[PDB]
Amino acid sequence: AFHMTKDMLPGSYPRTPEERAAAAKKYNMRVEDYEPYPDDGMGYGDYPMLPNRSQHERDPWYQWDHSELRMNWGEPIHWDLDMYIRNRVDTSPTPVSWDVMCKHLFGFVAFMVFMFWVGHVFPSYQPVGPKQYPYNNLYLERGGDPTKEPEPVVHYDI
Amino acid sequence: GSKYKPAPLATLPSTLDPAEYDVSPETRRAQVERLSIRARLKREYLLQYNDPKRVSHIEDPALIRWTYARSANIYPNFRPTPKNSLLGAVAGFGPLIFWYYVFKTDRDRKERLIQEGKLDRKFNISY
Amino acid sequence: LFAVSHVLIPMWFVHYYVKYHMATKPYTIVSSKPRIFPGDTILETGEVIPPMRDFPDQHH
Amino acid sequence: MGAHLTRRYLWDASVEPDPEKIPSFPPDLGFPERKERVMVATQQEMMDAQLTLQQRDYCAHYLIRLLKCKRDSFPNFLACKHEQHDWDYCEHLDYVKRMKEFERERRLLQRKKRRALKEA
Amino acid sequence: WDKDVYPEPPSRTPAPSPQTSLPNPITYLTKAYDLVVDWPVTLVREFIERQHAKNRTYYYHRQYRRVPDITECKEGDVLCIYEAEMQWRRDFKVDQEIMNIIQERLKACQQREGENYQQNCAKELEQFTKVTKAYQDRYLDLGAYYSARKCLAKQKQRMLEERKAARQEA
Amino acid sequence: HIQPRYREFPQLTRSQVIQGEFLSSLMWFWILWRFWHDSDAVLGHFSYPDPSQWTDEELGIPPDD
Amino acid sequence: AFCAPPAYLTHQQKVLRLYKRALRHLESWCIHRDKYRYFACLMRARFEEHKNEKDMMRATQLLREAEEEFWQNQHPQPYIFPDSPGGTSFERYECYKVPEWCLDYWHPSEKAMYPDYFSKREQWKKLRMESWDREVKQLQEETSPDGIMTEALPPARREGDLPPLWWHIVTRPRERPT
Amino acid sequence: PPLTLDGIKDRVLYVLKLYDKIDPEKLSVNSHFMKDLGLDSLDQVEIIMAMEDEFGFEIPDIDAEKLMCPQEIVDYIADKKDVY
Amino acid sequence: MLCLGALTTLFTAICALTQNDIKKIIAFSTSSQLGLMMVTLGMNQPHLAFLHICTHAFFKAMLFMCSGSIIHSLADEQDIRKMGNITKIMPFTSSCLVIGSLALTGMPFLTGFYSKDLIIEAINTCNTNAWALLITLIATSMTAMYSMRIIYFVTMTKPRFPPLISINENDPDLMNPIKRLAFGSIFAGFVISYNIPPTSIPVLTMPWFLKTTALIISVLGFLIALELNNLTMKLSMNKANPYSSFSTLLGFFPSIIHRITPMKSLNLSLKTSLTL
Amino acid sequence: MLKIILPSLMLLPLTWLSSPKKTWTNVTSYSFLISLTSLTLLWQTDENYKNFSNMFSSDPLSTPLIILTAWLLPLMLMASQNHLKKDNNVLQKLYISMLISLQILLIMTFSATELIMFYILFEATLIPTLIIITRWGNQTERLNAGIYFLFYTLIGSIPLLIALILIQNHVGTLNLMILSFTTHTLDASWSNNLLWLACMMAFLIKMPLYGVHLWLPKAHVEAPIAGSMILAAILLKLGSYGMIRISIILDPLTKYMAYPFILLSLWGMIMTSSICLRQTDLKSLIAYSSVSHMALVIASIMIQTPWSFMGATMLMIAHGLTSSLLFCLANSNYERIHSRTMIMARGLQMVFPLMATWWLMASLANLALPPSINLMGELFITMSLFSWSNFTIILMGINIIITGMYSMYMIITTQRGKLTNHMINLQPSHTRELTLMALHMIPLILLTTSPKLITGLT
Ligand SMILES: CCCCCCCCCCCCCCCCCC(=O)OC[C@H](COP(=O)(O)OCCN)OC(=O)CCCCCCCCCCCCCCCCC
Ligand SMILES: CCCCCCCCCCCCCCCCCC(=O)OC[C@H](COP(=O)(O)OCCN)OC(=O)CCCCCCCCCCCCCCCCC
Ligand SMILES: CCCCCCCCCCCCCCCCCC(=O)OC[C@H](COP(=O)(O)OCCN)OC(=O)CCCCCCCCCCCCCCCCC
Incomplete structure (x- = not known):
């Protein structure tokens, strides 16, 4: 651990207000922006609860020290930066509201699926009777048993 | 007149964010300050990476505080509550018990059928 | 021309392989039949396939 | 996509025949005598011409001809044209054969309905 | 290759009956292949086989003769049973390449008879069940620790059935 | 090699125009040639029968009763 | 990308940066040109009026209702240029922008050819080490007298001194490596 | 062809000479759009946008709130596409 | 698969109508044509499905390299919005593009026509989902529409490309292959259909509306699209958002x-x- | 088999007696040839397995491994010449000897007729491994990792000791040959239901099962590269080899006493595969990849169908070679980067063109690309698992999709993307690094040509 004191590494949930302001230094944040992850004992500890926004909408023009993570050097990394990376989940505002999206998409899906059902109920079939194959519907050639002759299926003219 | 409606995804854009438009003097003071923390950190990366005569690895300790927080500062901050042990048993034994009654029932259906003589097992000369 | 180089040299080899390994080994190059039609002769046996009947439908 | 669908789905029913079971009345519902269809090709001729089972129709015989003139006349793929018309025609003449059978079954079922009201 | 273990049907080919003035683009090419691809190769190959026939050598088959099986074998006598689990593990393979041949002989009979496979190729599929119903009846339930003692039991569990069912029919 | 042009219609080489008109004209020669020799795009060449003109004798429609 | 981000945004830069997104999102709707150039000088009108509102409150109430009018009247697929974010050719030729500190591990054979190239390269590396001291000192002697620090860095202010923290704005991998 | 500065220089000059508000016989590099050519800030948004469409790339917002000399535009464009 | 092939055909085609990226529109068309290919496999007509695969390869390959020519010749502009009047500036690719476009729209006596209308009328004659039958046909009209979208925006319009113009397609390596595939796109359907073995026993007997449906729907598909493109040139209704989004x-x-x-x-x- | 072993022992005298400067080449060159003598065992022209002598035997299952165990010693000694080149000339000769003893012991364990010979040699391999991990381990936590590696194996080991002494009294000899040709059929009592667990549990522990696999992620993290190669390639497979030879007895119980493990493994396969999806330490991700691809194996050595066992033998040899390759290249990045973090070091192909080709082939071996023994293996275990219950494809079907995702993510965020701006400049690749890789993959290409050799006993 080259140059890392325990107090320069994370610690326990900041209980007293002086500890919440000490941690905010460790993490190079503003003391009024350090909002520890809720204390429900799932391990987060003192790690800052940074806004859940993906690196996708981090200004795409600024010279980010780490270009591809669109993260500067020192800025507190997000807990789930392994998911909000540009190559994965996005949380980038969308011109259409999310609900509107979910409803519309699935509506389409449902209407389609349904209409397809209306279809199977009412199919489209030309005015043509059934096709007629010779012999006994090709009983033997459809691989039928040579020994056992089939009930003759005959087809008459017109 | 549809109003954009940020969801945990598809969040509220910068514009259309009421907070941003109106802000108290204190707020500006914050922002004017947060830049300072960043500018400070920026001028602590930019004259150590642009330093001639350097071979050592710029460390990015903000990433080292992240990994330690995520794989070596977890169990020292574990307190067994409810919503954690109920949810810590449904996850380990829940499906593990689900599939057992999925595989037992199938394996038992199969065995019965084989025993009674129905399963065809045709052209199956391998297993 | 060099064209022949990597079209002819590879070919001889392949042929060497296909006519003296594959061909030789059993069921390595199998075909279908030759689609004989009524009235066409079978070279190997000498038989002449019997012709069809004289359907006179016409009316095209 | 004809009007047959309209007649069955929309509006009336029990008149337009069911696509399945088209041949549903006795082969002679008043048909005095009807010679069964005739198959020109021998079950073997087909098996030797390797005609796909589906293509073994009552036109299998004009097909074999086409295929003959397509193997022969090989370098020329544009010259077995009369043979294709023939096959196709044979295929139409049975396409209409099927059309006629369907219409006959339609009308016959109507007969039933007409006869039905004679009843009471 | 034995024409009888890997059979192969006689060939029937329609004779050439051209009905077009145009010249077949295949016949010309072959006439070349036969000269610029076959002759050159043909020459080399022969020269191979004469190099072989000078110091012609031979290799035999290693006939394994029979030996007491399990049912003849004492219980606990690891010597006899060892010699007899091998005699079976050996026939577990000889009885497996046989099934490899029926897997193969068939495959060919459905490439050689397309569009007729439904019918012409039923000499073998009748055999692929006459051989599969047997392989299923001596070697299938067994674990990966297949041993002659277990085939002896897989059988003998069922020899009851061909004796309980039979007696049952009474 | 050609020369960059600013706010002007790029000069065109003889070949660019001729090859372009060549490919298009052959497309039209082929469409016209086949249409004349084989006009079965419309009607195929087999006419649909009017299913509603089949004398009741034709279909086996017994005389009602 | 070059200049540093201001801390907070003014009223103006927010208005004047809508005039860009707006007009540029009006040229996706107006695919043609005469229609566009028309429908756009009509846009300026909208911004042209309500230019002299002195009532800030009002101004920030026209802006807040402009950017919602816009969000709901934007094009899903606008015209974003290539080499700009999101659109193509953005990071295309970055696979070929190697970072230039890699020519330092080249085998003496490789660097044997390309001879004058490394003769000028060694000059520039002498420039870089010859000023790090005067630079960092400058960066510091001119340090802020307050915690208010912006990422803006100072110019040279003396002859011979190289405008500071410059080794990576100059010596940047070329854009199109090709 | 690659963009030589003395060309890019003329190209940016040219387009402005086609903007009606900016006199065609005075626009002179080093003639600040706003304090010399006397153009509205609202205009400068457009003047830049024209350039972004003459040279086919986007001058980022923060770097373009300052393209006011009619020359800054000529070195910034050139510095962007690496024209020495 | 008849059902899902059908849904993809229209779903992808409707999405293609509003896409403004030239490569993207062609790609959606790749999916829509395969949706038709999926439909024929679903209607158990395997041989014709394979026939479309071969004909599909010639024309789609052409259109994409055609746009390759436009994108490379222009300063890497991949958007139909900034690309215009390629017909006069670059007749060689424009000629290749329309040849490909008409093949995609099943122009009579071109490679698409020999295989595509066989598939269309197959649908019109088989017993099928009514919803599948209707969507596949309007999908065919949509193929004409987006085909129309590409040539109107990319080729027949006042130029909107960046002002300096440097276009060269003279390089043999561009023309030759584009030229060679164009010959294939013009003659391949003729050659493949006659040569292949008789298969599938098609139904050439149809009421004339169904026999000519593929031809007419393709014709009005372009007709309607041409009407809509004209509406754009007018000075009115800058913004148009009729579910356009779902599509875009x-x-x-x-x-x-x-x-x-x-x-x-x-x-x-x-x-x-x-x-x- | 004392040429694969005695000449090996003599390596120890050579590492010690040889000159400090020439110690490395004498040892690596000689064990390459030691591997060549190992290849002679592959000459089996008959089904009768090869019983070299009373205590030493080699059957199809052991032979494919003995050769791998002999093969990696050369490679291990080539991958640790860098780190361990900063030592005092007597710390090296200890590390080299430690590596030498591992394959001496492992060669014998894989080539042992008496099951308790397996146990004594089986549990001895921990001594050399714990020293390699604890003494040379870089991180502060290796003392902990060593404890985890010793206790999980040891607590499992003493039950097996009691069980094997137990069967010796019940049957009268622990000789794998006889035990096979003798009637040992457990009687489904409650006690036997315990015997079975006693014998399998020790093997199931070092073959990380979902329940007890925490030892392997911790151990490989701080272990030096040579220790991580040994643990993944040969050490974990010791557990599989044991399960194949021990379930010859306990024949009836595993029919119904396996369900617990089978379900533990298949669900475990999914979760272990998934956590690979977001793990920042590359060595961490390869280790969980190793747990999941080994969870498939315990689910084939328990279904017990000929193909399973054959799939298992294929996958174990194949995954062994692939994992090392991944652990070896992870180390090359670690030594120049100086950090295990996956997020740093992005874009390497731009600066290390070939290592990236090795990275790509290693990942394609990691996921199941088809002309690879890795796929043949999974395809077979998949088939049998399907036979056990058609539903198994769902769980063995979520693993395949996840396995593709993490394997490519290792390539996408380590060997592609924009280059890291200026980490300590990354010196070019040594020829040793590249060969150490080539030596791993060239055998993977050659084995895939003729899969029959690693096909198992079934
Ligand atoms: C037909 C009628 C019914 C219709 C609906 C039926 C369901 C259809 C969909 C079923 C599930 C399909 C797979 C879901 C994931 C699809 C792939 C994906 O989402 O990756 C894209 C993601 C972001 O990329 P994108 O949004 O395209 O933007 C790129 C340009 N900005 O790029 C990423 O890298 C995302 C992260 C990828 C790595 C982790 C992904 C999860 C891996 C395990 C889960 C895999 C998916 C779930 C299991 C399989 C389900 C089928
Ligand atoms: C991604 C795959 C999507 C498609 C999956 C389903 C495909 C078709 C197969 C399911 C339907 C088969 C119907 C024919 C009978 C098959 C044999 C059979 O009898 O199945 C029995 C099985 C029993 O399961 P169970 O619900 O426990 O019933 C206990 C009854 N005393 O009852 C079942 O059939 C179970 C059906 C499968 C359920 C598991 C797979 C889908 C869900 C995955 C969940 C993963 C997480 C597991 C749970 C986590 C939370 C606890
Ligand atoms: C042994 C147990 C495990 C030990 C692991 C470590 C061992 C290291 C030290 C020993 C290394 C050498 C010994 C292992 C390799 C053995 C190679 C071999 O056995 O080749 C056999 C092959 C003859 O083929 P054969 O299978 O006899 O014929 C089949 C007839 N039905 O003869 C040949 O054809 C040789 C051909 C050489 C070049 C072949 C290249 C072919 C590549 C094909 C796949 C390409 C794509 C692979 C994708 C992989 C993706 C990861």
Whole structure:
């Protein structure tokens, strides 16, 4: 651990207000922006609860020290930066509201699926009777048993 | 007149964010300050990476505080509550018990059928 | 021309392989039949396939 | 996509025949005598011409001809044209054969309905 | 290759009956292949086989003769049973390449008879069940620790059935 | 090699125009040639029968009763 | 990308940066040109009026209702240029922008050819080490007298001194490596 | 062809000479759009946008709130596409 | 598969109508044509499905390299919005593009026509979902529409490309292959259809509306699209948003199913399966 | 088999007696040839397995491994010449000897007729491994990792000791040959239901099962590269080899006493595969990849169908070679980067063109690309698992999709993307690094040509 004191590494949930302001230094944040992850004992500890926004909408023009993570050097990394990376989940505002999206998409899906059902109920079939194959519907050639002759299926003219 | 409606995804854009438009003097003071923390950190990366005569690895300790927080500062901050042990048993034994009654029932259906003589097992000369 | 180089040299080899390994080994190059039609002769046996009947439908 | 669908789905029913079971009345519902269809090709001729089972129709015989003139006349793929018309025609003449059978079954079922009201 | 273990049907080919003035683009090419691809190769190959026939050598088959099986074998006598689990593990393979041949002989009979496979190729599929119903009846339930003692039991569990069912029919 | 042009219609080489008109004209020669020799795009060449003109004798429609 | 981000945004830069997104999102709707150039000088009108509102409150109430009018009247697929974010050719030729500190591990054979190239390269590396001291000192002697620090860095202010923290704005991998 | 500065220089000059508000016989590099050519800030948004469409790339917002000399535009464009 | 092939045909085609990226429109057309290919396999007509695969390869390959020519000749502009009047500036690719476009729209006596209308009338004659039959035909009109969208925006319009013009397609390596495939696109359907073995026993007997349906729907598809493109040139109704979006941002399957699944599948590993 | 072993022992005298400067080449060159003598065992022209002598035997299952165990010693000694080149000339000769003893012991364990010979040699391999991990381990936590590696194996080991002494009294000899040709059929009592667990549990522990696999992620993290190669390639497979030879007895119980493990493994396969999806330490991700691809194996050595066992033998040899390759290249990044973090070091192909080709082939071996023994293996275990219950494809079907995702993510965020701005400049690749890789993959290409050799006993 080259140059890392325990107090320069994370610690326990900041209980007293002086500890919440000490941690905010460790993490190079503003003391009024350090909002520890809720204390429900799932391990987060003192790690800052940074806004859940993906690196996708981090200004795409600024010279980010780490270009591809669109993260500067020192800025507190997000807990789930392994998911909000540009190559994965996005949380980038969308011109259409999310609900509107979910409803519309699935509506389409449902209407389609349904209409397809209306279809199977009412199919489209030309005015043509059934096709007629010779012999006994090709009983033997459809691989039928040579020994056992089939009930003759005959087809008459017109 | 549809109003954009940020969801945990598809969040509220910068514009259309009421907070941003109106802000108290204190707020500006914050922002004017947060830049300072960043500018400070920026001028602590930019004259150590642009330093001639350097071979050592710029460390990015903000990433080292992240990994330690995520794989070596977890169990020292574990307190067994409810919503954690109920949810810590449904996850380990829940499906593990689900599939057992999925595989037992199938394996038992199969065995019965084989025993009674129905399963065809045709052209199956391998297993 | 060099064209022949990597079209002819590879070919001889392949042929060497296909006519003296594959061909030789059993069921390595199998075909279908030759689609004989009524009235066409079978070279190997000498038989002449019997012709069809004289359907006179016409009316095209 | 004809009007047959309209007649069955929309509006009336029990008149337009069911696509399945088209041949549903006795082969002679008043048909005095009807010679069964005739198959020109021998079950073997087909098996030797390797005609796909589906293509073994009552036109299998004009097909074999086409295929003959397509193997022969090989370098020329544009010259077995009369043979294709023939096959196709044979295929139409049975396409209409099927059309006629369907219409006959339609009308016959109507007969039933007409006869039905004679009843009471 | 034995024409009888890997059979192969006689060939029937329609004779050439051209009905077009145009010249077949295949016949010309072959006439070349036969000269610029076959002759050159043909020459080399022969020269191979004469190099072989000078110091012609031979290799035999290693006939394994029979030996007491399990049912003849004492219980606990690891010597006899060892010699007899091998005699079976050996026939577990000889009885497996046989099934490899029926897997193969068939495959060919459905490439050689397309569009007729439904019918012409039923000499073998009748055999692929006459051989599969047997392989299923001596070697299938067994674990990966297949041993002659277990085939002896897989059988003998069922020899009851061909004796309980039979007696049952009474 | 050609020369960059600013706010002007790029000069065109003889070949660019001729090859372009060549490919298009052959497309039209082929469409016209086949249409004349084989006009079965419309009607195929087999006419649909009017299913509603089949004398009741034709279909086996017994005389009602 | 070059200049540093201001801390907070003014009223103006927010208005004047809508005039860009707006007009540029009006040229996706107006695919043609005469229609566009028309429908756009009509846009300026909208911004042209309500230019002299002195009532800030009002101004920030026209802006807040402009950017919602816009969000709901934007094009899903606008015209974003290539080499700009999101659109193509953005990071295309970055696979070929190697970072230039890699020519330092080249085998003496490789660097044997390309001879004058490394003769000028060694000059520039002498420039870089010859000023790090005067630079960092400058960066510091001119340090802020307050915690208010912006990422803006100072110019040279003396002859011979190289405008500071410059080794990576100059010596940047070329854009199109090709 | 690659963009030589003395060309890019003329190209940016040219387009402005086609903007009606900016006199065609005075626009002179080093003639600040706003304090010399006397153009509205609202205009400068457009003047830049024209350039972004003459040279086919986007001058980022923060770097373009300052393209006011009619020359800054000529070195910034050139510095962007690496024209020495 | 008849059902899902049918849904993809229209779903992809409708998305293609509003896409403004030239390569994207062609790609959606790749999916829509394969949707038709899926439909024929679903109607158990395997041989003709294979016939479309071969004919599909010639023309789609042409259109994409045609746009390759336009994109490379222009300063890497991949958007129909800034590309215009390629017909006069670059007749060689424009000629190749329209040859390909008409083949895509099943112009009579071109490679698409020999295989595509066989598939269309197959549908019109088989017993099938009514919803599938209707969508496949309007999908065919949509193929004409987006085909119309490409040539109107890319070729027949006043130029909107960046002002300096440097276009060269003279390089043999551009023309030759484009020229060679163009010959294939013009003659391949003729050659492949006659040569292949008789198969499928098609039904050439149809009421004339169904026999000519593919031809007419393709014709009015362009007709209606040409009408809509004209409406654009006028000075009016800058913005038009009639569900245009659902069409323009891929039916919203990308916006929603790509942000939820990768988010709920990774959150569960880190937060629940790994750490808990 | 004392040429694969005695000449090996003599390596120890050579590492010690040889010159400090020439110690490395004498040892690596000689064990390459030691591997060549190992290849002679592959000459089996008959089914009768090869019983070299009373205590030493080699059957199809052991032979494919003995050769791998002999093969990696050369490679291990080539991958640790860098780190361990900063030592005092007597710390090296200890590390080299430690590596030498591992394959001496492992060669014998894989080539042992008496099951308790397996146990004594089986549990001895921990001594050399714990020293390699604890003494040379870089991180502060290796003392902890060593404890985890010793206790999980040891607590499992003493039950097996009691069980094997137990069967010796019940049957009268622990000789694998006889035990096979003798009637040992457990009687489904409650006690036997315990015997079975006693014998399998020790093997199931070092073959990380979902329940007890925490030892392997911790151990490989701080272990030096040579220790991580040994643990993944040969050490974990010791557990599989044991399960194949021990379930010859306990024949009836595993029919119904396996369900617990089978379900533990298949669900485990999914969760272990998934957490690979977001793990920041590359060595961490390869280790969980190793747990999941080994969870498939315990689910084939328990279904017990000929193909399973054959799939298992294929996958174990194949995954062994692939994992090392991944652990070896992970180390090359670690030594120049100086950090295990996956997020740093992005874009390497831009600066290390070939290592990236090795990275790509290693990942394609990691996921199941088809002309690879890795796929043949999974395809077979998949088939049998399907036979056990058609539903198994769902769980063995979520693993395939996840396995593709993490394997490519290792390539996408380590060997592609924009280059890291200026980490300590990354010196070019040594020829040793590249060969150490080539030596791993060239055998993977050659074995895939003729899969029959690693096909198992079934
Ligand atoms: C991604 C795959 C999507 C498609 C999956 C389903 C494909 C078709 C197969 C399912 C339907 C088969 C119907 C024919 C009978 C098959 C044999 C059979 O009898 O199945 C029995 C099985 C028993 O399961 P169970 O619900 O426990 O019933 C206990 C009854 N005393 O009852 C079942 O059939 C179970 C059906 C499968 C359920 C598991 C696979 C889908 C769900 C995955 C969940 C993963 C997480 C597991 C749970 C986590 C939370 C606890
Ligand atoms: C037909 C009628 C019914 C219609 C609906 C039926 C359901 C259809 C969809 C079923 C599930 C399909 C797969 C879901 C994931 C799709 C792939 C994906 O989302 O990756 C895209 C993601 C972001 O990329 P994108 O949004 O395209 O933007 C790129 C340009 N900005 O790029 C990423 O890298 C995201 C992260 C990828 C790595 C982790 C992904 C999760 C891996 C394990 C779960 C895999 C998915 C779930 C299991 C399989 C389900 C089928
Ligand atoms: C042994 C147990 C495990 C030990 C692991 C470590 C061992 C290291 C030290 C020993 C290394 C050498 C010994 C192992 C390799 C053995 C190679 C071999 O056995 O080749 C056999 C092959 C003859 O083929 P054969 O299978 O006899 O014929 C089949 C007839 N039905 O003869 C040949 O054809 C040789 C051909 C050489 C070049 C072949 C290249 C072919 C590549 C094909 C796949 C390409 C794509 C692979 C994708 C992989 C993706 C990861």
